[PDB]
Scaffold this active site. Structure first.
Site, PDB file in Angstrom:
ATOM      1  N   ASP A  31      65.020  45.231  57.344  1.00  0.00           N
ATOM      2  CA  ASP A  31      65.682  44.502  58.415  1.00  0.00           C
ATOM      3  C   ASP A  31      67.151  44.118  58.187  1.00  0.00           C
ATOM      4  O   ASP A  31      67.444  43.192  57.431  1.00  0.00           O
ATOM      5  CB  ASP A  31      64.832  43.247  58.648  1.00  0.00           C
ATOM      6  CG  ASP A  31      65.247  42.451  59.844  1.00  0.00           C
ATOM      7  OD1 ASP A  31      64.816  41.289  59.912  1.00  0.00           O
ATOM      8  OD2 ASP A  31      65.971  42.966  60.716  1.00  0.00           O
ATOM      9  N   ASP A 219      70.643  46.034  64.580  1.00  0.00           N
ATOM     10  CA  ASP A 219      69.428  45.555  63.938  1.00  0.00           C
ATOM     11  C   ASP A 219      68.349  46.611  63.714  1.00  0.00           C
ATOM     12  O   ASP A 219      67.655  46.996  64.639  1.00  0.00           O
ATOM     13  CB  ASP A 219      68.872  44.412  64.793  1.00  0.00           C
ATOM     14  CG  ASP A 219      67.743  43.685  64.128  1.00  0.00           C
ATOM     15  OD1 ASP A 219      67.119  42.836  64.797  1.00  0.00           O
ATOM     16  OD2 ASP A 219      67.488  43.958  62.933  1.00  0.00           O
TER      17      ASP A 219
HETATM   18  C1  LIG Z   1      61.365  43.340  60.770  1.00  0.00           C
HETATM   19  C2  LIG Z   1      61.507  41.837  60.966  1.00  0.00           C
HETATM   20  C3  LIG Z   1      62.321  41.492  62.198  1.00  0.00           C
HETATM   21  N1  LIG Z   1      63.667  41.447  62.031  1.00  0.00           N
HETATM   22  C4  LIG Z   1      64.467  41.144  63.070  1.00  0.00           C
HETATM   23  N2  LIG Z   1      65.778  41.118  62.829  1.00  0.00           N
HETATM   24  N3  LIG Z   1      64.036  40.876  64.305  1.00  0.00           N
HETATM   25  C5  LIG Z   1      62.704  40.916  64.492  1.00  0.00           C
HETATM   26  N4  LIG Z   1      62.282  40.643  65.748  1.00  0.00           N
HETATM   27  C6  LIG Z   1      61.771  41.224  63.471  1.00  0.00           C
HETATM   28  C7  LIG Z   1      60.319  41.244  63.788  1.00  0.00           C
HETATM   29  C8  LIG Z   1      59.481  40.168  63.510  1.00  0.00           C
HETATM   30  C9  LIG Z   1      58.128  40.236  63.860  1.00  0.00           C
HETATM   31  C10 LIG Z   1      57.601  41.382  64.490  1.00  0.00           C
HETATM   32  C11 LIG Z   1      58.437  42.498  64.786  1.00  0.00           C
HETATM   33  C12 LIG Z   1      59.800  42.369  64.399  1.00  0.00           C
HETATM   34  N5  LIG Z   1      57.974  43.687  65.413  1.00  0.00           N
HETATM   35  C13 LIG Z   1      58.911  44.835  65.670  1.00  0.00           C
HETATM   36  C14 LIG Z   1      59.036  45.763  64.454  1.00  0.00           C
HETATM   37  N6  LIG Z   1      60.413  46.232  64.320  1.00  0.00           N
HETATM   38  C15 LIG Z   1      60.733  47.277  63.528  1.00  0.00           C
HETATM   39  C16 LIG Z   1      62.214  47.632  63.522  1.00  0.00           C
HETATM   40  O1  LIG Z   1      59.943  47.919  62.863  1.00  0.00           O
HETATM   41  C17 LIG Z   1      56.671  43.912  65.857  1.00  0.00           C
HETATM   42  O2  LIG Z   1      56.358  44.968  66.395  1.00  0.00           O
HETATM   43  C18 LIG Z   1      55.528  42.847  65.718  1.00  0.00           C
HETATM   44  C19 LIG Z   1      54.403  43.459  64.876  1.00  0.00           C
HETATM   45  C20 LIG Z   1      55.026  42.515  67.136  1.00  0.00           C
HETATM   46  S1  LIG Z   1      55.890  41.314  64.862  1.00  0.00           S
END
Ligand SMILES: CCc1nc(N)nc(N)c1-c1ccc2c(c1)N(CCNC(C)=O)C(=O)C(C)(C)S2
Ligand SMILES: *[C@@H]1O[C@H](CO)[C@@H](O)[C@H](O)[C@H]1NC(C)=O
Length: 333
Positions: A31, A219
């Site tokens: 991330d 991001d």
């Molecule tokens: C990777 C951590 C993260 N980093 C940032 N900067 N924004 C976010 N919204 C998240 C973040 C947090 C929780 C989830 C999530 C992303 N995602 C998207 C995954 N994103 C990627 C780039 O793989 C999901 O799908 C869930 C399981 C619902 S839970």
């Protein structure tokens, strides 16, 4: 060093890291949107079903463990997690760095019950680090083993055959195997956040977005491309899309004909095609198709802003230059 990433529905890209001695394996996302490292803790109550469906780090099994216990909370746009700090060695694609990571013990079902991965590895600057915990890529630079203070990302298209690599993150360079042409860098509007200046978003023949400028957060940790409800509502009206609870959809048979969306950056239009941003599950008018573009109202100091997640990275290989506070971009290959 490069680290293979698995692709989960074009919405989740993660690789593998090893914490502890012996190493305890963990699926994690890299991330650029956060700055801390955390993984599901063995001390997590099994009343959090999320912990029951994920890998847990146990410290009574690592001899290279160093207790700290300070408590921290990581608040993400789509969900929050909580726990305490711990230190131990971590292996990321061949490199080994001693890190202070978050042993999460409060991990909500929704959304984490839908997490294909376990924890997260923040790639952002320490300026955003919660608990002022030194980020990892900083710890890695303290080694002076990397040929360049840069790391890149490569997100592939959710292929349906276990043979293609979901993606790849290289530490120290930018693998030429996945981008053509040359990179076009933009400078960070400030050091401490992987954000840059965007000079308008256009939808076909009408820069009906981000006029007079706006902010853009690159991001890798975000699944889609986002803007502020105002921005999105306006963009989303220009397509014939309908708003739901957590996304937008357009009668599937009208997706191959939605228009292009070009994001003006650093002085070069980066254009996306319907195929690029729509999950074309079907071609009928009796079904609905989701758009890989959402509304997210990122709070300051980073917000308001647009987020360029995996939807945008799938088309353009990204290089993150720490040494020159600039983000590179090249066509995907
Ligand atoms: C990777 C951590 C993260 N980093 C940032 N900067 N924004 C976010 N919204 C998240 C973040 C947090 C929780 C989830 C999530 C992303 N995602 C998207 C995954 N994103 C990627 C780039 O793989 C999901 O799908 C869930 C399981 C619902 S839970
Ligand atoms: C945790 O690490 C921080 C970072 O320097 C340190 O100041 C603190 O003493 C540690 N916590 C404890 C209680 O050991």
């Amino acid at each position: 060093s490069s680290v293979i990433l698995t692709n989960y529905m074009d919405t989740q890209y993660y690789g593998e890291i090893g914490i502890g001695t012996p190493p305890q394996t963990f699926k994690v996302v890299f991330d650029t949107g956060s700055s801390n490292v955390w993984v599901p803790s063995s001390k997590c109550s099994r009343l959090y079903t999320a912990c029951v469906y994920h890998k847990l780090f146990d410290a009574s099994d690592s001899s290279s463990y160093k207790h700290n216990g300070t408590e921290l909370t990581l608040r993400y746009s789509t969900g929050t997690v909580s726990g305490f700090l711990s230190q131990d060695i971590i292996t990321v694609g061949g490199i080994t760095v001693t890190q202070m990571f978050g042993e999460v013990t409060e991990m909500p079902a929704l959304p984490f019950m839908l997490a294909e991965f376990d924890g997260v590895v923040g790639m952002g600057f320490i300026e955003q680090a919660i608990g002022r915990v030194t980020p990892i890529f900083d710890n890695i630079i303290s080694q002076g083993v990397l040929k360049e203070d840069v790391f890149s990302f490569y997100y592939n298209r959710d292929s349906e055959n276990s043979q293609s690599l979901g993606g790849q993150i290289v530490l120290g360079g930018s693998d030429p195997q996945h981008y053509e042409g040359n990179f076009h860098y933009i400078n960070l509007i400030k050091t401490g956040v992987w954000q840059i200046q965007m000079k308008g978003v256009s939808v076909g023949s009408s820069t009906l977005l981000c006029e007079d400028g706006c902010l853009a957060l690159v991001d890798t940790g975000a699944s889609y491309i986002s803007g502020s409800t105002s921005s999105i509502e306006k963009l989303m009206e220009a397509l014939g899309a309908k708003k739901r609870l957590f996304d937008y959809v357009v009668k599937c048979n009208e997706g191959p004909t939605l228009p292009d969306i070009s994001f003006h950056l650093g002085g070069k239009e980066y254009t996306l095609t319907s195929a690029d941003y729509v999950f074309q599950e079907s071609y009928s008018s009796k079904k609905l198709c989701t758009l890989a573009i959402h509304a997210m109202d990122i709070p300051p100091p980073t917000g308001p802003t647009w987020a360029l997640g995996a939807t945008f990275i799938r088309k353009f290989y990204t290089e993150f230059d720490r040494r020159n506070n600039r983000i590179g971009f090249a066509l995907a290959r």
